[PDB]
């Protein structure tokens, strides 16, 4: 059975580029392409693609559910079984929906979060896609209530594979593979179980047009610190003389603050939160 | 005597040729007893030895859940490795893990393991004290910091001292007639002449279990440590193993040479001498 794949991604903007490859008999050999609704009717009047089909610029005509068959000369039919299916979804065909996380984007390891996609546009389906993932976007039917259509995607139990940058999309009836422009991205972070750091303030949590800097430090070797106000900031950690690793976030000229440690090359997983600290103005 | 349980897993990315593949296998001593293969149709841990086949359904549900969890974790670790080593997403890479434990004759814990390789090279390993980690390069040094910040060695220590040893002891009993057996080698010698002045003496050992064995050649007493062609011990396919050792001898001197066979199945080690 040939292995079909889209590169770099099956979710692709109109005007972008995507390559369909058909790997069969240790070769990306000669192959023909088929779409759903065409079944055993080869697309492009039976074009026998040679190496890999570069669709560029991508148009809405490239959207579809594709399978390939590869050349098999010493065979009865001369060709191979149909490959696995690859769904090319073309984005940028409607105005973007909105994406928000309930209760919020910071998710304790093992827990759950709802990513709600919604729009004033009446989308029949919504898709949720984590950036850089080859998995099929998750698909749900749009529910209609009070001038908006929406869909609640349940994410969890939370872990590193589910953290990252998410976008959601809408599509309308009869063109399901033609997706909207992506929603504004939402970063979903898994917190724990790394050891929570400590939060402190300079000169202190009591200020009245005065400036304050909040220090987040730890014995664990965090490379990054993240300061969160209940009502988002990022800074590299510096090796201090206790061998501790600190970062100083200047705030001034209040709020309840927590901070989280983070490691190099791992931007979506943070420590347990520090204990809350209240800056009172 | 002493015994061991090992789980070995291999994770392979193969962009454009297949989805990432995860294969895990469980052994007691030299005897495989389970497998999981992410590409196979069952998506279950499967028995690969008769004596585990009578484990109840809850065992297979529990083991399947854990090995699938491992599959997901190591397939994410492939992605992480690309970032740590600044490698491109087009290449194929290999991520291997081994964990398990040894027990002595008394069934008490002797050693535990929990270690990883990336592209055929040591990556990170749990130390003998089961409390600290050996990181083999700067990328694994990141993992070490994370794992220290998470105190994860505690969970490894708890598994190795309790669950792993408890399972090994249980399996040793389940498969006693096959795991605690000791099949001796059947031996013989072949002779082949190289020239008018040399010949090859090959000492053969076949049908033995476990796979541990010593074949050695001596000439008048001093063993030919660096003149003996040794072949890696190979599986016969029925659960026994085979091995041979050969030495090159001046024709007419075959009587000076003796092959020595040491194996737990032998009451007394064998001293074999070729004769026409």
């Amino acid at each position: 059975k040939p292995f079909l794949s889209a590169w770099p991604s099956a979710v692709v903007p109109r005007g972008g580029h995507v390559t369909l490859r058909c790997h069969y008999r240790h070769r990306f050999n000669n192959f023909m392409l088929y779409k759903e609704d065409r079944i055993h009717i080869p697309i492009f009047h039976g074009r026998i693609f040679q190496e890999s089909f570069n669709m560029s610029p991508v148009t809405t005509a490239h959207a579809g559910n594709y399978t390939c068959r590869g050349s098999h000369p010493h065979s009865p039919t001369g060709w191979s079984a149909p490959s696995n299916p690859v769904v090319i979804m073309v984005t940028g065909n409607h105005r973007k929906p909105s994406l928000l996380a309930h209760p919020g984007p910071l998710v304790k390891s093992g827990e759950r979060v709802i990513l709600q996609c919604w729009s004033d546009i009446m989308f029949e389906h919504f898709f949720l896609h984590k950036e850089g993932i080859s998995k099929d976007p998750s698909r749900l039917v749009g529910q209609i209530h009070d001038g908006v259509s929406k869909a609640n995607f349940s994410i969890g139990p939370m872990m590193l594979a589910l953290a990252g940058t998410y976008r959601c999309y809408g599509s309308v009836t009869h063109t399901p593979y033609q997706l909207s422009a992506p929603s504004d991205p939402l970063d979903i972070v898994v917190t724990g179980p790394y050891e929570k750091p400590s939060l402190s303030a300079q000169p202190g949590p009591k200020v009245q047009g005065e400036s304050v800097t909040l220090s987040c430090s730890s014995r664990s070797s965090y490379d990054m610190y993240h300061l969160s106000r209940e009502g988002e900031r990022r800074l590299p950690a510096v090796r201090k003389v206790n061998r501790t690793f600190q970062a100083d976030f200047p705030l001034g000229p209040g709020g309840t603050y927590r901070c989280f440690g983070s490691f190099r090359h791992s931007p979506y997983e943070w420590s347990d939160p520090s204990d809350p600290l209240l800056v009172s103005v | 005597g002493s015994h061991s349980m090992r789980y070995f897993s291999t994770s392979v990315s193969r962009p454009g040729r297949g989805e990432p593949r995860f294969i895990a296998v469980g052994y007691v001593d030299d005897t495989q007893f389970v497998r999981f293969d992410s590409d196979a149709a069952s998506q279950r841990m499967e028995p690969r030895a008769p004596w585990i086949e009578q484990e109840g359904p809850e065992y297979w549900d529990e083991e399947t859940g854990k090995v699938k969890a491992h599959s997901q974790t190591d397939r994410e670790n492939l992605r992480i490795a690309l970032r740590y080593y600044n490698q491109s997403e087009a290449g194929s890479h290999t991520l291997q893990m081994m964990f398990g434990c040894d027990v002595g004759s008394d069934g008490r814990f002797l050693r535990g393991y929990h270690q990883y390789a990336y592209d055929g090279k040591d990556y990170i390993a749990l130390k003998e004290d089961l409390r600290s980690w050996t990181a083999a390069d700067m990328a694994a040094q990141i993992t070490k910091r994370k794992w220290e910040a998470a105190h994860v060695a505690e969970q490894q220590r708890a598994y190795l001292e309790g669950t792993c040893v408890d399972g090994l002891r249980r399996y040793l009993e389940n498969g006693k007639e096959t795991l605690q057996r000791t099949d001796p080698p059947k031996t013989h010698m072949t002779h082949h002449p190289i020239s008018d002045h040399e010949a090859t003496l090959r000492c053969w050992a076949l049908g033995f279990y476990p796979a541990e064995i010593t074949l050695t050649w001596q000439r008048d007493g001093e063993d030919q440590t660096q003149d003996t062609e040794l072949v890696e011990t190979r599986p016969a396919g029925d659960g026994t193993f085979q091995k041979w050792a050969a030495v090159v001898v001046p024709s007419g001197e075959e009587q000076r040479y003796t092959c020595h066979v040491q194996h737990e199945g032998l009451p007394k080690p064998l001293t074999l001498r070729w004769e026409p």
Partner: peptide, 9 residues
Amino acid sequence: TYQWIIRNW
């Protein structure tokens, strides 16, 4: 008896 392998690199 398999181990829970849950901590990523």
